[PDB]
Amino acid sequence: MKIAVMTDSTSYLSQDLIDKYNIQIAPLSVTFDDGKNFTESNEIAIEEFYNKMASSQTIPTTSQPAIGEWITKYEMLRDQGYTDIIVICLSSGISGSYQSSYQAGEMVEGVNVHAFDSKLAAMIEGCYVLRAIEMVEEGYEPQQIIDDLTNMREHTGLYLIVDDLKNLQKSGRITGAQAWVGTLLKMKPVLKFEDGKIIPEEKVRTKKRAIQTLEKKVLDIVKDFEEVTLFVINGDHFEDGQALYKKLQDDCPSAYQVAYSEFGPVVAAHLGSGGLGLGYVGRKIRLT
Ligand SMILES: CCCCCCCCCCCCCC(=O)O
Secondary structure, eight states, rough: OOOOEEEEEEGGHHHHHHHHTOOOOOOEEEEEETEEEOOOOOTHHHHHHHHHHHHHSSOOEEEOOOHHHHHHHHHHHTTTTTTTEEEOOOTTOOOSSHOOOOOOHOOOOOSEEEEEEESSOOOHHHHHHHHHHHOOOOOOOOHHHHHHHHHHGEEEEEEEEEHHHHHHTTSSSHHHOOOOHHTTTEEEEEEEEEEEEEEEEEEEEEHHHHHHHHHHHHHHHHHOOSSEEEEEESOOOOOHHHHHHHHHHHOOOOOOOEEEEEOOOOHHHOOOOOOEEEEEEEEEEOOO
């Protein structure tokens, strides 16, 4: 028995972790109305996508990985001795990458495909990947890993801040004058993930209190966990994510695992500019 672990590109793992563990990636795409397509990878210039997103008069569309992209890596991993494949996917409540990962694995013979619904995104979804690899090396069989990843999912979440009432209007969720009810007013909607779905939490003015809202909300949850792994997931506002990341290191004991990361074009296409999140895991995930 040999078990492999792969995922889609929305888990935004570091290129070091991908290269070290040979993690195969099924990329998501984002197509603008200009005809230009950005296939998610660690080769694009994220700053130039943000400029293109601000350039484009309309917000682009997102697409899950093509079924053929899942197949070629599935049959590849099979064509090297892997008896089982664990697939951590983007949350099925927000995307169709989990549906395509299951159906494509049914069309690949010789290996047992195990699609997992992360019920989240970004490095929090990537934490499931690093936890699956850690268990495979320890000598765990697939359903033992899925049972653990299902248990880890019960103590895992992510809050996020949206600072782009602009981008919220070109998508049709707020009217033209509603942007001029928050932008001048500096109102920041605060959302959170629940059961794989993005539901509204609070609407805190100023980004500072909204960031302080993220800290107090996540710290009050993880204070009852035996193991804690925090992840600052920042957008194109570098100073905002670092201020929260540094404030966390000062306010949290070193027993807590505090990490920094950034999301890519697919997640940014829906968040816009200045997006910022804060996720947590009830486990001491191996990030090395
Ligand atoms: C930084 C906080 C994480 C925010 C995650 C936003 C996810 C919403 C975008 C949904 C992407 C759907 C992808 C697809 O079309 O298949």
